[PDB]
Write an enzyme that holds these catalytic residues in place. Structure first.
Site, PDB file in Angstrom:
ATOM      1  CG  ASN A 134      -0.304   4.663   3.464  1.00  0.00           C
ATOM      2  OD1 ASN A 134      -1.051   5.398   4.084  1.00  0.00           O
ATOM      3  ND2 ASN A 134      -0.731   3.590   2.832  1.00  0.00           N
ATOM      4  CE  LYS A 150      -2.823   4.620   0.112  1.00  0.00           C
ATOM      5  NZ  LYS A 150      -4.270   4.982   0.021  1.00  0.00           N
ATOM      6  CG  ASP A 203      -2.538   1.964   6.212  1.00  0.00           C
ATOM      7  OD1 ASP A 203      -2.817   0.880   6.775  1.00  0.00           O
ATOM      8  OD2 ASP A 203      -3.340   2.534   5.447  1.00  0.00           O
ATOM      9  CG  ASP A 205      -2.150   0.930   1.040  1.00  0.00           C
ATOM     10  OD1 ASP A 205      -2.444   1.349  -0.104  1.00  0.00           O
ATOM     11  OD2 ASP A 205      -2.816   1.242   2.058  1.00  0.00           O
ATOM     12  CB  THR A 261      -4.670   3.711  -3.976  1.00  0.00           C
ATOM     13  OG1 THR A 261      -4.902   3.646  -2.558  1.00  0.00           O
ATOM     14  CG2 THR A 261      -5.325   4.929  -4.528  1.00  0.00           C
TER      15      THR A 261
END
Length: 299
Positions: free
Chosen positions: A141, A138, A158, A136, A177
């Site tokens: 984060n 991105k 996260d 995750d 995402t």
């Protein structure tokens, strides 16, 4: 976990963030006065319930966070749980998103940008050394511990999608995402550490150009751009980007995971560790496209 009431050991304050079945609140431990972030995660509780997070998934996140101790990753302090929630008492990262911070600077050379990028690479190196995929990665984060210091520490946060990769790949969900997820995620194929490296490529691309490489005009087109690896170094944004930087990105935005630069390779890439002064100056003379980056950061 701890079955006592959170509220007997902590006072809570303002909400910091919220996800689908999670809220993060600022808190303060009563016995030490030290401040933390409490991430309340809603359990679905029954397998057929769809109004929470699988307790197995929660354990995975907790199990990973307990294992990691590294300056560029968030620390887990304690875990509580009651009938509805598992509460992660985490290190408080107060400095906001990395991109918002960089967005305040008047300009930014590629050399300065690599100084921050290198911290992300360092955190991910550590994770990948332990066979942990984040899945995750991105800009949101990627946080700062404290935005008011000489050189701010980056914190990767996260770990809600993170997995141990014991067999070189994992065959699961793991969908984050659209904008930042690797083609194998989009196409529901097996997933490994290399997915993280793709994500690093996307962040880098945005950091220098201000543009999102696979952002379509609809979510479905975005996933389709990603799957086809349809991106360009459009002159409008990259005319002031070094060939080294372009080469860095090009070796991460590769459809086949197996062909993709590893984290060990990216730390050795001459854009990151110049082998000579000409390369060093090249990176020093190139600049972040700051006025478009500011517009991205404000979106």
């Amino acid at each position: 976990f701890r079955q006592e009431n959170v509220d007997d050991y902590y006072d809570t304050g303002e909400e910091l963030g919220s996800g689908q079945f999670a809220v993060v609140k600022k808190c303060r431990e009563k016995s030490t006065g030290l401040q933390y972030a409490a991430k309340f995660i809603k359990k679905r509780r029954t397998k057929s319930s769809r109004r929470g997070v699988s307790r197995e998934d929660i354990e995975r996140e907790v199990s990973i966070l307990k294992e990691i101790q590294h300056p560029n990753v968030i620390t887990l302090h304690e875990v509580y749980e009651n009938k509805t929630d598992v509460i992660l008492i985490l290190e408080l990262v107060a400095g906001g998103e990395l991109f918002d911070f960089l967005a305040e600077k008047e300009s930014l050379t590629e050399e300065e940008a690599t100084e921050f990028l290198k911290q992300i690479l360092n955190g991910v190196y550590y994770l990948h050394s332990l066979q942990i995929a984040h899945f995750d990665l991105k800009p949101e984060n990627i946080m700062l511990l404290d935005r008011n210091v000489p050189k701010p520490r980056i914190k990767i946060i996260d770990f809600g999608l993170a997995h141990k990769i014991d067999f070189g790949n994992e065959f699961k969900n793991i969908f984050g995402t659209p904008e930042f997820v690797a083609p194998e995620i989009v196409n529901y194929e097996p997933l490994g550490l290399e997915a993280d490296m793709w994500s690093i490529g996307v962040i880098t691309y945005i950091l220098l150009s201000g543009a999102s490489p696979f952002l379509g005009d609809t979510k479905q087109e975005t996933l389709a751009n990603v799957s086809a690896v349809n991106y360009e170094f459009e002159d409008e944004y990259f005319s002031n980007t070094s060939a080294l930087a372009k080469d860095f990105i090009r070796r991460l935005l590769v459809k086949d995971p197996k062909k993709r630069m590893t984290i060990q390779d990216s730390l050795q890439h001459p854009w990151i560790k110049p082998k000579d002064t000409q390369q060093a100056l090249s990176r020093k003379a190139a600049a972040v496209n700051m006025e478009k980056f500011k517009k991205f950061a404000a979106r």
